[PDB]
Each structure stands twice: as C-alpha cells, then as structure tokens.
Amino acid sequence: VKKIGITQLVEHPALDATRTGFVKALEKNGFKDGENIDIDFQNAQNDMPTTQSIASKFASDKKDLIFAISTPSAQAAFNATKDIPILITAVSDPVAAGLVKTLEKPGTNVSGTSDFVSVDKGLELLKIFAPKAKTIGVMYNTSEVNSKVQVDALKEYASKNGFKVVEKGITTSNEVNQGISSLVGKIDVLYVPTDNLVASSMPIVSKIATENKIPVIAAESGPVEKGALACQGINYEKLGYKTGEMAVKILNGESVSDMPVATSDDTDIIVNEDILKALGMEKPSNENISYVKTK
Ligand SMILES: N[C@@H](Cc1ccc(O)cc1)C(=O)O
C-alpha cells in the first residue's frame, strides 16, 4: 500500500479544489484510499508552524509521496525532506520559492503544477467594470513569496499602462480590517493576488470594499465566490487533477527530478452577480461571463 501525505495550508476554495481534483485523478487511475493507497490528509489551519510540523511528521513517517498545496505548505515539505517525492500545486512561482531549479527540469525532489496567471488577465476586466480607473490598490502578505512576485508584476504592468499602485503590506489576519479601510479614498479598484492570507479573509475585504463602492478584481474565482466582484482565472480542480496524473507517474516509478512543472493557459471570466448588483452595475453583454452568488 503506497502512503501519501497531503499537506494543505488552509481551507480556501482554490486549495480545496486542488485536493478534490487530485484525489479524483488517483481514483480514475486505479488508486483508491483504503485499497492500494492510504491518504493522510493534514490541514495547517493557516498556521505556519503547523505546515512545518505536518511536513516533519510526513518525513519521519516515511511517506511514499507528499502532495503539498500552496507555497507555504510546499516550502515546509521541501525543508522537511529532500528524498521523498513532493508534488506541488497552487504554487505561483516554484523557482522563486526555492523548490525547483527550472520549471522544465526541477533538479530536486519536487515537481507538480503552478497556478501562475498573468496580472494582465484580471486587469483586462477594468475595461468592463471600471474603465476610468487609474489607481489600483493591492493588499498582500509580505511573508508570501508568491505574493511578492505578483505585486512586482502588478507594478510592472502599471508602469507600462498608466496606472498608479497603492500597496498595503500586512503579515497577520488581524491587520486586514485597518488595511482595507486605509485603502478607502485612495484607490479606484482593488486587485487580489493569489495571496493565502487575503484569500482567507475575503468576506471581510468584500464587505468593507463593497460598502465603499470599490470594485475588487481577484486573480481567481475563490475570492469571487467569497465576495470579490470578478476574475479571469484558472480552474483549480483541473490543476489538482493534473497533479494527480503526475502522482500516478511517480507512484509507477517515473523520476520527479526530470518531470516538468505544468501550468494552465485556460481562464474563464466569473462574476459575483450579488456584488455586481450591490455596486449598481449592469450585467455586460459578454456571453463568456458566468455568474456566481455569494458562498
Ligand atoms: N498561489 C498561492 C495559493 C493561492 C491560490 C489562490 C488564491 O486565491 C490564493 C492563494 C501560493 O502560491 O501559495
């Protein structure tokens, strides 16, 4: 029986979706929990020390494979073991996180999928929902390398395309209230990168932003379900399913160190119709938009 450890940072929609897809891929390929695999699922509940203790225990348990969901969980798994294969998902920038040498040839015990998406995809939506906006706010966790890379990308785009960026770096969930509140009066739109801290506090961000008539564009649909206005993002269940197919390969003997990291080029526009209505906006004509209601 192959023993798989799954280390997930926290329940937020994107991370949950990757776990769902990964398990379905393994099952479709004949690997079934309680039969020829054992899945030990561990949630850190957003606690950074717990990402490290989960990973430590998976290494001392001698798991056959570790599936790590998010940058923090992956970094912890990599710190814990350089021998057990680690498959990642929902990692924005595996190279910047120190997990792989290159995407095409990791050269380490880590491979999997990246949730990289260009800032351009979300900022395209300004033409639709805030066509006169000139100042973009971004709140993010200064401890997440995934977020730092995306903020740099945002600033590069803004410098190219005539926008101002106002940053609010935080490190704790207790800072969210004053952080979003402080951006009121100073921004035309909020961009939410794939930041685990902010994604976990989206209902708060949404409530204050929407009361202040600030559109919030997120990088992916989880925050939209939790009260952001819109996104043009990837499908995280599919990303997880791809990672499970790569697991099948590793369980069957393929070398993780030569397995290329996979990404998705397929995005979909999803809008929260409740938030749209609260902002006094009309549904645009665009046939490719799908609508969600608040989770
Ligand atoms: N990209 C994040 C995970 C994440 C995904 C979706 C989000 O909305 C937020 C965070 C990481 O590298 O850890």
Residue numbers in the entry: 44 to 338
Publication excerpt:
The C. difficile antigen CD0873 is annotated as a substrate-binding protein component (SBP) of an ATP-binding cassette (ABC) transporter and is an immunoreactive protein in human infection.
The closed structure has a tyrosine molecule (retained during purification) bound. The structural and biochemical information reported in this study demonstrates that tyrosine is the ligand of CD0873. The exquisite specificity of CD0873 for tyrosine is likely achieved through the tyrosine OH group. This is hydrogen bonded to the side chain of Glu-263, and to the main chain carbonyls of Val-235 and Pro-236 through a water molecule. In VC_1101 and SP1069, Glu-263 is replaced by an alanine: the lack of an appropriate hydrogen bond donor in these proteins explains their preference for more hydrophobic amino acids. Gln-284 in SP1069 aids binding of tryptophan through a hydrogen bond to the indole nitrogen; this glutamine is replaced by a tyrosine in CD0873 and VC_1101, which prevents binding of the larger tryptophan side chain through steric hindrance. Comparison of the structures shows that the proteins share a common mechanism of binding to the amino and acid groups, but show sequence differences that account for their side chain preferences.
